[PDB]
Amino acid sequence: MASRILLNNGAKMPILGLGTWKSPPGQVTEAVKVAIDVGYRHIDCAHVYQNENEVGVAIQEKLREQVVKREELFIVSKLWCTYHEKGLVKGACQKTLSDLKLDYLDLYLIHWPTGFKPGKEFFPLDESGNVVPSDTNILDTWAAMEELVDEGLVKAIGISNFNHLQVEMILNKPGLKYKPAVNQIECHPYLTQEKLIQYCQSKGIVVTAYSPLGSPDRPWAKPEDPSLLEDPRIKAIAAKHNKTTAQVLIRFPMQRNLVVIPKSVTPERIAENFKVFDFELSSQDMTTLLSYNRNWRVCAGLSCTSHKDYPFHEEF
Ligand SMILES: NC(=O)c1ccc[n+]([C@@H]2O[C@H](COP(=O)([O-])OP(=O)(O)OC[C@H]3O[C@@H](n4cnc5c(N)ncnc54)[C@H](OP(=O)(O)O)[C@@H]3O)[C@@H](O)[C@H]2O)c1
Ligand SMILES: O=C(O)COc1cc(F)ccc1C(=O)NCc1cccc(C(=O)O)c1
Incomplete structure (x- = not known):
């Protein structure tokens, strides 16, 4: 299938990217280098992951080597929760840009x-x-994100872990200037997200699926999960x-018109995970995988359940 999806800002986004949460700083430079060498053109980053400097070393080197051109890369980062105030957003974005060695981001998300x-x-x-x-509140933070587009720091803005009422709040914002391009949410066969995905897609918002393999290295894993x-x-x-099972888990969201961002620091798995453009799951396979839903979350945010904007009380 086609390698990129058209966003509502007019730019194209690669449907397969490399995740970087938990990638150790001493391994992520080589992970990103290998990923670019084997065809990845989209890297998912965040300031809170504490490894953007090392991701940036890899990007800058592959640009210097002319393995890729900057316009062929699609680099995503995210505004952390302690930077939602309007006077902190630009500096947070600029720190991420400095660390990643970039002059602009392709996409910048409100992380939560x-x-x-x-x-x-x-x-x-x-x-x-x-x-x-x-x-x-999410609306004032959104206005600060819009400024970043108008200053040339980011090509697109979006949201992450927003429930459908929160997406709707953005879409109904008085004076909205730019609609979110993307909502990045957890999605896999145990958390299939039919309602939130259809809502976002119906509004022209592209959905990115995170933790597509179920995040086996998540720090809070329990044996009974x-x-x-x-x-x-x-x-x-x-x-x-x-x-491989991982290849099925990556192809699954692709066939739902989602972007997907599996994480690995293992060279052989980085290459394996990209070899998903040469087979098709049947409709029956897709419906069978959907049937495994159990509303199970890698990222449940149990310490935030009293926050006024906690996203996971709502059905979706
Ligand atoms: N927006 C958000 O709030 C949010 C939240 C969570 C995640 N994310 C993003 O989504 C990315 C992916 O999610 P994730 O990191 O939670 O987990 P994931 O991608 O579902 O799983 C990563 C784990 O799977 C292993 N793995 C990778 N490829 C494999 C393969 N072919 N066979 C077997 N095991 C394999 C990795 O091991 P090795 O690395 O040791 O190879 C690692 O332990 C994150 O890195 C981050 O970029 C965003
Ligand atoms: O968030 C990600 O990308 C992956 O998880 C993390 C990664 C980190 F480096 C550090 C903390 C987390 C984490 O606890 N997330 C969950 C989270 C965070 C903020 C608010 C809520 C909430 O429920 O409102 C939930």
Whole structure:
């Protein structure tokens, strides 16, 4: 299938990107270098991942080597929760640009709808142990994101982990200047997201699926949690197609018109995960994979459930 999807800003976004959350700083430069060498043109980043400098080393080198041109790359980052105030957004974006070695981002996302008190700590706490919100609202943060487009820092802006009412709030914002281009949400066979995906797509917003493999390296994994990569039912579909389970899990969102961003620092898996443009899941395969939904989240945000903008109380 086609390698890129057209966004509502007129730019094209590669449907397969490399994730970088948890990629160790001493391994992510080589991961991104390998990814670019084997065909990746989209890298998903974030300031909170604490490895943008090292991602940037890889990008800048592959540009210097003329393995790729800047206009062929699609680099995404995200505004962290402690930078939602309007006077902090530009500096947060500019720090990410400096670290990534870039003059512009292709896409900049509000990482989560929940703003937190600014300061050095990424999760400022009171007990008492609760995260300290900021009195920022998603609409004013969105206006600050729009400014970044108008200053040339970013080509596109979007949102992440917004529920359908929060997307609707952006779309209904008084004086809205730019619609979100993307909503990046968790999505895989255990969290299939039919309602939120159809809503976003119906509005021309492209959905990116994160944790498509079920994030087996997530730091809070428990043994009793379900495991996509080990699910016999998914392994059977992979065997039928002569592909790996991971390749099925990556192809699945692609056939729903989603972008997908599997993470790896393992060279052989980085290459494997890209070899997903040469086979097709049947409609029956797709419906079968959808049937595995259980509303299970890698990223549940249990410490934020009292935040006024917590996204996961709503059905979707
Ligand atoms: N917007 C948000 O709030 C948000 C939240 C979560 C994630 N994300 C983004 O989405 C990306 C992907 O999600 P994720 O990192 O949570 O998890 P994931 O991509 O679902 O899974 C990554 C894990 O799978 C392993 N793996 C990769 N390819 C494999 C293969 N072919 N066979 C077997 N194991 C394989 C990786 O191991 P190795 O690395 O050791 O190879 C790593 O342990 C993130 O890195 C981040 O960029 C965004
Ligand atoms: O967020 C990601 O991309 C991947 O997870 C992380 C990565 C980090 F480097 C550091 C923390 C997290 C994390 O706890 N996320 C979940 C989260 C964060 C903020 C608010 C909510 C909420 O529920 O409002 C939920």
